[PDB]
């Protein structure tokens, strides 16, 4: 069959009747205040079986890591819990082999995820703080890397102290959209020429780097505008709102750190630290990593990908028909998007969950961090080529090493070519746009104010170009942008010393042994095990549109797309693969996150 | 043979030593340089100091090899 | 026509040949960088910028104001 607009459709009344049954299947709930959210998980949007088996394999390694950790601590009960997990791996392999009610996958896979993201104890054994497991304060820094017993310790754990690795975070890390070029310095962050010459040497001058556009500042001001420090088992968790200047060598080069002021306001208690300051410099970078840890997890990640997509998923189900062509474009990019968000709002960012414990703020202060970034968003001005220019990080000659930019711009360009060919095949006039009562109903709910549940800055969808950008952006922030923030969790964030949600001694002015700054052992194992799970599931692939049913047969039916348009999309993504992989090999800090073969279709974990 | 050994040490050192601060903050290398930079009467190598640069470590490893 | 001219005061009193003295002047005019020759620019070119180390430098201090 072939999709058609509502005004062109041969059978308008039947099209209208599925829409009404749809708005009953998908009705709004207030699970997170000021946000349009799904009233649970509607039966059609249950996680598919292959997603569960994929998740189940990782969810077993996390528990097996916990059990092996509990054998080592206190050096058959700790063996019985292992064999049930080992048998659950046998369940996922053989019981789900035919793929044709739900037994292992329904309860265990969804429950084991719920126990991990819910920070619940007893995550050791299914259907069968504890001083019998890693807990308390660290004896030595070894105990953090000794947590990774059945899972793999990340490579950053042996590299995080190097200054070049600290700067690689700002261009190839979890939050790689942070830096912005500056031509002059803030009043509240007056780094001297001495600090700049410490990092760069005697071949450059600070007044010349601001001249040649080689200065790059990264702020965390919003963390200070929003959060409130919480206490875990009496212990004080602390997070700052740093200001970090970076600079590139002259004539081209990669990012390199310069200065860090842990607080927004200069004070006696808050002063600039620089490259040659030894221990205080390392704790000055670590205080930044706590800020990025809170920022990434609630702004870049859960805020501006998950929760930005939740309204667009809803308005699409409620205003576009199953015969609408844009419904055909966007819906498969929403697979598991409603289900993981429900598991997020009732477990992850819930009181008693992982974020409230490991991270520094009160969970209510953390939610206000997400909403503030959601409220200042301009959907029409969030294109990756648009945000790059806005931060001045565009010249490939000046700033040479920016994997999120250079790899992402090939992925954004590929999607635009595909959306454009899609929009132009079905929308053959600007009247086809304005006469779409469904698309304009779709627009009205999303153009609504932020206090009513809308997406900030979404207006107005009146041109085919306005539909192309809105559709290209949605696909990007469901596939590439979510890849560049979800999967760095496993590779770059599972090691609490390298980065975590809380600094556990008060200040960047070093108070003594580095082991006291890190989180407790029970939380560190939780951060390692839950950032492993969310960051370690690659299910569904950008460019391959199928269903969530057992056959997983192709989702498109119009032969214009089946044998022409989508093949053209898949070819340009394969060209970006060869281009990204080649350039990626020459690098020593890797960016697999924009590699097309690993990019998912949807936000699914 | 000297040129072959230097090139392979310049390759080795530069893979693990990426910053001139990786050299100074290598406490083991600094305590390694100490017992060797000692006075010859106290048991050192005559003229072994200082080993504070990626270059200086490349020479020491080339001569020894 | 008089000073740096043959038989002038620079020809007699100064050690060089009068035509070697002209090459000296023209050599510096040729090596200059007019755009990078501001006083505050050259002061940090030469590392003479710290007033807490080199405290007595009347040309730099009086000249920058």
TrEMBL record, chain A:
Comp. bias regions, Basic and acidic residues: 10-24
The UniProt record lists the keyword Translocase: no
InterPro entries per record: LipOase (IPR000907), LipOase_C (IPR013819), LipOase_C_sf (IPR036226)
Chain intervals for the UniProt region annotation (Disordered): 1-24, 75-89
A family per Pfam: Lipoxygenase
Lipoxygenase domain boundaries: 129-605
Molecular function via GO: metal ion binding; oxidoreductase activity, acting on single donors with incorporation of molecular oxygen, incorporation of two atoms of oxygen
Keywords linked to the UniProt accession: Metal-binding, Oxidoreductase
Lineage top rank: taxon: Bacteria
GO biological process: lipid oxidation
Protein name: Arachidonate 15-lipoxygenase
Organism: Enhygromyxa salina
């Amino acid at each position: 069959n072939i999709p058609t607009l509502p005004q062109n459709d041969p059978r308008p009344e039947q099209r209208a009747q599925q829409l009404d049954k749809a708005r009953e299947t998908y009705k709004y709930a207030d699970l997170l205040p000021p946000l349009a959210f799904c009233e649970g998980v509607p039966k059609p949007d249950t996680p598919s079986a292959a997603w569960l088996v994929t998740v189940g394999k990782v969810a077993a390694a996390v528990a097996l890591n916990a059990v092996a950790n509990r054998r080592a601590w206190k050096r058959f009960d700790v063996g019985g819990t292992s064999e049930e997990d080992q048998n659950e791996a046998g369940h996922n392999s053989f019981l789900a082999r035919l793929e044709n009610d739900e037994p292992s996958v329904l309860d265990e896979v969804n429950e084991r995820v719920a126990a991990i993201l819910g920070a619940k104890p007893n995550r050791h054994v299914p259907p069968a703080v504890s001083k019998d497991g890693p807990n308390g304060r660290p004896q030595s820094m070894d105990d953090y890397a000794n947590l990774f017993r059945r899972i793999t310790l990340p490579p950053i754990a042996s590299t995080w102290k190097n200054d070049s690795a600290f700067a690689a975070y700002r261009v190839a890390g979890p939050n790689a959209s942070m830096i912005q070029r500056i031509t002059e310095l803030p009043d509240n962050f007056a780094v001297t020429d001495a600090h700049y010459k410490q990092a760069m040497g005697e071949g450059d001058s600070l007044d010349a780097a601001k001249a040649e556009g080689r200065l790059f500042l990264a702020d965390w001001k919003l963390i200070g505008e929003t959060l409130v420090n919480n206490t875990y088992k009496g212990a004080q968790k602390t997070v700052y709102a740093p200001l970090a200047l970076f600079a590139v060598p002259p004539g081209g080069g990669s990012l390199a750190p310069v200065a860090i002021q842990p607080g927004q306001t200069p004070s006696p208690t808050n002063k600039i630290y620089a490259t040659q300051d030894g221990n205080d410099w390392l704790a000055a970078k670590s205080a930044v990593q706590v800020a990025e840890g809170n920022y990434h997890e609630l702004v870049s990640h859960l805020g501006l990908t998950h929760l930005l997509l939740e309204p667009i998923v809803m308005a699409t189900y409620r205003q576009l028909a199953q015969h609408h062509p844009i419904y055909m474009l966007l819906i498969p990019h929403f697979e598991g998007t409603l289900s993981i968000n429900n598991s997020a709002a009732t477990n992850l960012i819930a009181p008693g969950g992982a974020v409230d414990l490991i991270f520094a703020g009160t969970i209510e202060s953390e939610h206000q961090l997400a909403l503030a970034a959601l409220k200042r968003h301009d959907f029409m001005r969030s294109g990756l080529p648009d945000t790059i220019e806005q931060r001045g990080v565009g010249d490939t000659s000046v700033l040479t090493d920016y994997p999120y930019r250079d790899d992402g711009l090939k992925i954004w360009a590929n999607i635009e070519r595909w959306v454009t060919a899609y929009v132009n095949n079905y929308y053959i006039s600007e009247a086809n746009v304005t006469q779409d009562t469904e698309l304009q109903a779709w627009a009205a709910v999303l153009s609504k104010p932020f206090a009513e549940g809308g997406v900030s800055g979404f207006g107005p969808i009146d041109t085919r170009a306005a539909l192309i950008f809105a559709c290209t952006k949605v696909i990007f922030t469901a596939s590439a942008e979510h890849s560049a923030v979800n999967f760095p969790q496993k590779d770059l964030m599972s090691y609490a010393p390298a980065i975590t949600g809380a600094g556990w001694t008060a200040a960047p002015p070093s108070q003594g042994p580095l082991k006291d700054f890190q989180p407790p052992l029970e939380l560190a194992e939780l951060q390692a095990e839950f950032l492993y799970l969310l960051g370690g599931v690659h299910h569904t692939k950008l460019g391959f549109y199928n269903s969530n049913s057992f056959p997983y047969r192709a989702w498109f039916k119009d032969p214009k797309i089946t044998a022409e348009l989508l093949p053209a999309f898949q070819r340009d993504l394969a060209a970006s693969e060869e281009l990204i992989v080649a350039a990626n090999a020459t690098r020593t800090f890797k960016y697999t996150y924009m590699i097309p073969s690993t990019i998912p279709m949807s936000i699914n974990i």
